[PDB]
Assembly symmetry: none
């Protein structure tokens, strides 16, 4: 420790820890996930009398192609690649969020979670991870669960902890399969490693207060994913069980 | 609920759907991935009477070394590096797939799936991730399954769901061992009908089922082999 710098280094480590201070640091530095209220604002500021239609179009890009704007434009129809390149220019759509408030097509989808899941269901044959992939895994996997925005519809209130956890594990059956399609590397990962890679936005979505819990519940009931008393459907229990397995 | 933006979000979800509008969007945005026609089209006119041997060679390189054309030539025989480099120049072979028109050895291999898989079986001892690997995990893992091409041959019709599922499971057992060896390489595109888009093109199901029965992976009554039933077990047992 004789050098004056190694002396300072050694000293740095000889202090007591301000636990509280380091924990505030940990909280700031910690994934919080997207802000939907400001993604909506931006879409509505930007699109005006054309924002609902532009958004629907971006959400369907989200559902079917993910965030891969450029790669996808190179393989799609000319009229599609045109709209898409335009809407990117128009809203400043990015493939990966550099900042909070960056607008990725997935985040738009998430911010409007009830629509996106209904459209996912309505367009299930166009999903890269849809009915054909989910049938390999279980029977009757609910199509509404077939997008990146489902986690924001799972309740935490008005529903038992156990329900929330079954809904999460059932959703995770899809997340697992989806993750392996988006990140081929996860095809050689353990379940837990794959689970960690989507754990953070999953919890953020479930725990967020932006989209109100009572409507998540009413919606899940309406779709049949929650029974008349707020308990997951049998298909959902079957899917959670298949996730827990093997 | 509590925020005008929240209220907007739930109100957006209460909109009745316009199926026609949303399907238009879907069809026009559908990503094609691989178009085998474009690749065979290019290889053929360009090669001429010289194309079939050039394709075979490109695919043998694809089964042994994937895309690493340059890295690969650096250490292969002079004859190997010469012929191989000649073919890159001739056909425009790239290592990464940038555009829909990009020609990689793997894409060539996947445009002719039946051949590849069959070459693969016959050159199994030269496969990077082969029997030595998979005879540890099961016995008699089908050698045809041991490559990138196979996923293109999974039948989605004319067979039972139990059969499609068994083939997907049996094959995932190889994909998974193979992806691990790549996840670790010091520094790619998998393909099958179930993950592919409405836009994509595969050998028709009946040709898939026919080839499968021919190589013995499916039996003559449509049902997967023991070696497949089994090795799908190994997968299902984690
Ligand atoms: Na690990
Ligand atoms: Na119930
Ligand atoms: Na609509
Ligand atoms: Na079409
Ligand atoms: Na290995
Ligand atoms: Na049979």
């Amino acid at each position: 420790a004789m050098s004056e710098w190694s002396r300072i280094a050694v000293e740095f480590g000889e202090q007591q820890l301000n636990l509280t201070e380091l924990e505030d640091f940990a909280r700031e530095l910690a994934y919080e996930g997207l802000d939907p209220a400001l993604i909506i604002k931006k879409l509505k500021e930007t699109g005006g009398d054309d924002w609902v239609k532009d958004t629907k179009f971006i959400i369907v890009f989200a559902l079917t192609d993910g965030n891969d704007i450029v790669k996808a434009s190179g393989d799609m129809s000319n009229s599609g690649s045109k709209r898409l390149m335009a809407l990117q220019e128009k809203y400043g759509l990015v493939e990966r969020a550099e900042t909070r408030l960056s607008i990725t097509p997935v985040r738009v989808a998430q911010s409007l979670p009830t629509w996106t899941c209904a459209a996912a269901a309505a367009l299930k044959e166009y999903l890269p991870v849809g009915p054909a992939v989910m049938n390999l895994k279980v029977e009757n996997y609910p199509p509404e669960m077939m997008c990146m925005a489902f986690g924001s519809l799972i309740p935490t209130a008005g529903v038992s902890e156990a329900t929330t956890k079954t809904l999460m594990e059932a959703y995770s059956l899809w997340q697992d399969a989806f993750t392996k399609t988006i990140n081929v590397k996860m095809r050689g990962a353990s379940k837990t490693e794959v689970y960690n890679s989507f754990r953070d936005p999953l919890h953020a979505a479930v725990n967020s207060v932006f989209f109100p819990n009572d409507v998540r519940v009413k919606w899940l009931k309406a779709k049949g994913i929650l029974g008349p008393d707020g308990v997951p459907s049998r298909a959902a229990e079957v899917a959670a069980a298949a996730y827990r397995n093997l």
